[PDB]
Structure 1
Amino acid sequence: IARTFYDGPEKNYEKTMAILQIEAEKAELRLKELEVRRLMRARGDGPWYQYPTIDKALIDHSPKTTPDN
C-alpha cells in the first residue's frame, strides 16, 4: 500500500517547509506594504498618493502691458 499509493515523509516535510517560507514571506511583505502605504500617505514624498498640482507650463512669461506684471 505504501509503495503503490503513498510517498516518503521527506517529500511532505520539504513541501511543508517551502509552503511555510512562501507564507511567511507573504506575511512580511503585506506588513511592509501597509507600513509603506501609511508613510507615503502621511508624507507624500513617494510615488504613491501624488495628487495633481497646477502645471507651470501654462504660465505666460511675456511682458504684460505693465512693468509690475
Structure 2
Amino acid sequence: DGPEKNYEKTMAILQIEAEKAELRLKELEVRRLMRARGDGPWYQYPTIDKALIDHSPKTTPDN
C-alpha cells in the first residue's frame, strides 16, 4: 500500500499509547493520594455501624 496508510496508523497508535501512559501516571498518583488521605471511595476500611446502638432508657439515668 501507500506510505500514508502506515503514517496514519503510526499516528493513531502513538496517540493511543501516549493516552495510556498519561492515564497510568494519573492512576498511580490518585491511588497514592487516596491511600494517604482516605477521602475517596477507594481504601475505605469498615467502621462500626451506628444503627446497632440502642437508644432507650437504660435503668440508670447516666447511661
Give yes or no for the alignment of 1:11 onto 2:5: yes
For residues 17 and 63 of structure 1, the distance between their equivalents in structure 2, rounded to whole angstroms, comes to 73
1:29: how far off? 0.1
Q: What is the SS of the residue equivalent to 2:40?
A: coil
TM-align CA RMSD: 0.2
Cα shift readout 1:14-38 (whole Å, capped 9, x = no counterpart): 0000000000000000000000000
Q: Calculate the TM-score normalised by the size of structure 1.
A: 0.91
* Corresponding residue pairs, total: 63
Matches within 5 A, 1:36-55: 36-55=30-49
List alignment gaps of at least 5 residues for structure 2. Answer: none
Q: Calculate the TM-score normalised by the size of structure 2.
A: 0.99
1:45: how far off? 0.1
List alignment gaps of at least 5 residues for structure 1. Answer: 1-6
For residues 22 and 48 of structure 1, the distance between their equivalents in structure 2, rounded to whole angstroms, comes to 27
1:60: how far off? 0.2
Which structure has the larger Rg over C-alpha atoms? 1
Q: What is the SS of the residue equivalent to 1:41?
A: helix
Identical-pair percentage: 100
Q: What is the SS of the residue equivalent to 2:22?
A: helix
